C-alpha cells in the first residue's frame, strides 16, 4: 500500500503500527450521588448556611430537571404493536432534536424503570451518614450512594465541634460548601445545556463527588482487562436519569463499554525527519498518523484518540477523508507531497527504524565509529540511510548506536527522488497565499476576456 521507501527518502520514516479499537456494547450500573452532606451530628453549628446551600442547589438543579422532563413527559410504551419497537415518543411535543438526543431519551426511558426502584427507600438515601453507603435497590441488586462532603463533616468538623468556637465551625462548613459549589459549577452549571445525552464522561460527572471517580469505579467494580484504556479514552460515560429537588440527589447510569478491534484496520505513524534540498532544510507536510482500513487510506483525528504502544483507543470513529493528491503522495508520487522550509534550530534531524538509521548528515555530524571518519551526504541526497552493510556502528554526537540491515533496495543512497512544492502552514500565511492566487487567477481571467 504505502510506499515506505520513497516516503523515507523525503524524511517520513515509518514508525510503529498500531491497531484500531473502538468502544461498543456498554453495560449499565446505577449509582446515587447525594449533593448535600448529612449534618445531623453537628446541627448546633449549622446555622443558616444549609438553607442557603439548599436554595443554591435547587437553583442549580432546576434547569437539569426541566430539561429531563421534556423527554420524561413525552415518552411511553407503544400500545399499537411491539413488533418493531417498544418505546413510543411524541415528536410534535419534543419539536427539535438530533439523533443522539433521541437515542439518549430512549436510554433515559429504559433507565426510568430502575430509577423508580431507586426512588423507593428515599428516606434511606436521605439518612446516609457515610461517604459511601450500600443499600438494596432490589432483593438481588444493590445501589451505592455517594455523599458529596460527608468525609469532611465526619473527620474535620464533628471531632473539632468542642475545641473551637461554634461560629468558626459554621464558617468553615460554609466555605466547604461554597468550594464544592465552585468546583461543581464548571460542569453542572449553565454549561450543562443538554443533560439527556450520554456523552458525559465519568471524570466530569465525579465533580459532584469532589472529583473522586476512582472511588466510584472501584466501588462499582469493573473488568480489569482494559480498564485504564477505557477510562483514559473518555469511553466510560454516564447519564443523569433522575434529579430529586427535595432530597437533593441525582441518579447516574454509568456505562462500561468493551473495546472492539476493527478488523483489517490499522494506523501507521510517520516520524518526520528534516531533509536537504538546494542548500536548505525542509520537512514534508503530510499527516503523521494514517488510518488504513480495508486497504482504504484516510486521515484520523488522533487528538481525540488515546495513543498507546500497541493500539489506538477511541470512543467513536474519528476517520476523515483524504485528498487524492495526498493519497497519491503516500502511495509513491513524492512530487505531490508538500514541504515546508525549516528556519527553527530545534527539529528532528534523524530517526531509527528497524535498526536502520535515516539521518540528515548535512546538518548533523554523523561519523562511523568503525573507522573514525565522517559519513558524507552529497548535495543531491535528501537523506542518508545507514545500516551495517556500510557502517555497523554510527556515532551522532554523544550516542554510539549499532545499526541493523535495510530490507529495501540496495541502491537506496544512489537512486533519485522527485521533490514536491514548497508550502507555508501559518494561518495568516494561508490567507496571504489564498489572496495571491486569487489575484493571479483574476489576472488570468482578465487576459482571457
Amino acid at each position, epitope marked *: 500500500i504505502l510506499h515506505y521507501e520513497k516516503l523515507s527518502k523525503i524524511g517520513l520514516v515509518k514508525g510503529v503500527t498500531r491497531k484500531y479499537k473502538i468502544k461498543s456494547n456498554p453495560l449499565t450500573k446505577d449509582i446515587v450521588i447525594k449533593m448535600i452532606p448529612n449534618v445531623s451530628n453537628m446541627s448546633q453549628c449549622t446555622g443558616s448556611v444549609m438553607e442557603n446551600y439548599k436554595t443554591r442547589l435547587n437553583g442549580i438543579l432546576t434547569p437539569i430537571k426541566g430539561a429531563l422532563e421534556i423527554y420524561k413527559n413525552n415518552t411511553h410504551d407503544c400500545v399499537g404493536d411491539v413488533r418493531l419497537a417498544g418505546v413510543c415518543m411524541a415528536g410534535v411535543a419534543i419539536g427539535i432534536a438530533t439523533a443522539a438526543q433521541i437515542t439518549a431519551g430512549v436510554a433515559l426511558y429504559e433507565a426510568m424503570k430502575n430509577a423508580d426502584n431507586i426512588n423507593k427507600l428515599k428516606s434511606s438515601i436521605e439518612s446516609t451518614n457515610e461517604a459511601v453507603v450500600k443499600l438494596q435497590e432490589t432483593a438481588e441488586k444493590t445501589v451505592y450512594v455517594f455523599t458529596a462532603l460527608q468525609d469532611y463533616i465526619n473527620t474535620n468538623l464533628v471531632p473539632t465541634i468542642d475545641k473551637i468556637p461554634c461560629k468558626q465551625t459554621e464558617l468553615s462548613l460554609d466555605l466547604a460548601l461554597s468550594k464544592y459549589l465552585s468546583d461543581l459549577l464548571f460542569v453542572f452549571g449553565p454549561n450543562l445545556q443538554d443533560p439527556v445525552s450520554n456523552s458525559m464522561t465519568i471524570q466530569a460527572i465525579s465533580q459532584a463527588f469532589g472529583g473522586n471517580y476512582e472511588t466510584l469505579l472501584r466501588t462499582l467494580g469493573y473488568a480489569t482487562e482494559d480498564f485504564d484504556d477505557l477510562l483514559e479514552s473518555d469511553s466510560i460515560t454516564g447519564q443523569i436519569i433522575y434529579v430529586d429537588l427535595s432530597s437533593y440527589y441525582i441518579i447516574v447510569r454509568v456505562y462500561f463499554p468493551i473495546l472492539t478491534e476493527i478488523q483489517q484496520a490499522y494506523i501507521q505513524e510517520l516520524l518526520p525527519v528534516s531533509f536537504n534540498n538546494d542548500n536548505s532544510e525542509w520537512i514534508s507536510i503530510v499527516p503523521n498518523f494514517i488510518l488504513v482500513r480495508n486497504t482504504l487510506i484516510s486521515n484520523i483525528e488522533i487528538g481525540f484518540c488515546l495513543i498507546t504502544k500497541r493500539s489506538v483507543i477511541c470512543n467513536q470513529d474519528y476517520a476523515t477523508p483524504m485528498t487524492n493528491n495526498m493519497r497519491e503522495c503516500l502511495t509513491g508520487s513524492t512530487e505531490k507531497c508538500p514541504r515546508e522550509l525549516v528556519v527553527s534550530s530545534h527539529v528532528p534531524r534523524f530517526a531509527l527504524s528497524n535498526g536502520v538509521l535515516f539521518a540528515n548528515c548535512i546538518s548533523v555530524t554523523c*561519523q*562511523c565509529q*568503525t*573507522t*573514525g*571518519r*565522517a*559519513i*558524507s551526504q552529497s548535495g543531491e541526497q535528501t537523506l542518508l540511510m545507514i545500516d551495517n*552493510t*556500510t*557502517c555497523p556502528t554510527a556515532v551522532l554526537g554523544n550516542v554510539i548506536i549499532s545499526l541493523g540491515k535495510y530490507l529495501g533496495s540496495v541502491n537506496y543512497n544512489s537512486e533519485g527522488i522527485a521533490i514536491g512544492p514548497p508550502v507555508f502552514t501559518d494561518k495568516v500565511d494561508i490567507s496571504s497565499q489564498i489572496s495571491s492566487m486569487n489575484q493571479s487567477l483574476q489576472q488570468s481571467k482578465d487576459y482571457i476576456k
Partner: antibody
Amino acid sequence: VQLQQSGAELMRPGASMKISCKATGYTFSSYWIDWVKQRPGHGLEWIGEILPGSGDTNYNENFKGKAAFTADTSSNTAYMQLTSLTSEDSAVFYCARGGRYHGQGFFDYWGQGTTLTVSS
Amino acid sequence: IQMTQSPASLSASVGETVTITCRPSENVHIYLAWYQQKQGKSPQLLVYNAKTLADGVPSRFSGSASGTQFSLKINSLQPEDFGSYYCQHFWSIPYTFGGGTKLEIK
C-alpha cells in the same frame, strides 16, 4: 598532486625521527594523510593517519605511542615523529593521500618513501 | 581482519590471463583495493573499489568480488606487470594489507 618526503637518514637506537611529507596540488586540510610502514620481506604495514586542520588522528594499536602525527596547514606539511628507535624500525616509510570521508580509505597518491637505517 | 592471499608467488607468461585472490577474515563488503608495487618504487593504486578501476589505470586489469572472496584478473599479461600485488580492506581500523603476491614474467 605530489607528496615530497624527507631524505634517508641513519639513527642510533634510542633516538627520534621527524619525517616530513609536503603535499602540493590539493586542499591540504581536507584529505586524510595516512602513514604506512614497509620493512623488506614482511610486506606493507599501516602506521596510522592524521586529518590536517581538524587535528583528528587514528592510530594502529601496534604503533600507538611509538609514533605521533602532527600537521602544519600554513606550510601544508605532515609530520610523523618516531620515538625510541630500535632495530625493528629499519623500514621504508610512506606518506599516502587517503580519502576525505568514511569508506574512502584507498591511497590515491604516495610519496617516494623515506628510508630509515637504525644500527648500534 | 587478516588477509589470506593466494598464490604467495606465481610465474606467468606474456599474454596469459592470470588471477590473484585474497580472502579477508571478515566481510568487508565493497571496500577493498588492489595495489601494485615494483622494486624500489612506491605502490600504485590499481583498483580502489572491488570492481572499480582507478584513474590512469589501463582497462587491462579488472577486479571482481564474490562476496566471500575478492579477486583481480589480468588479461593479456605484459612484461611491465611484474612485481608484487597487495590488497587492502579499509573497512575498519586498523587497515590491513595483504600478504603480497609476487608475479614474475615467465
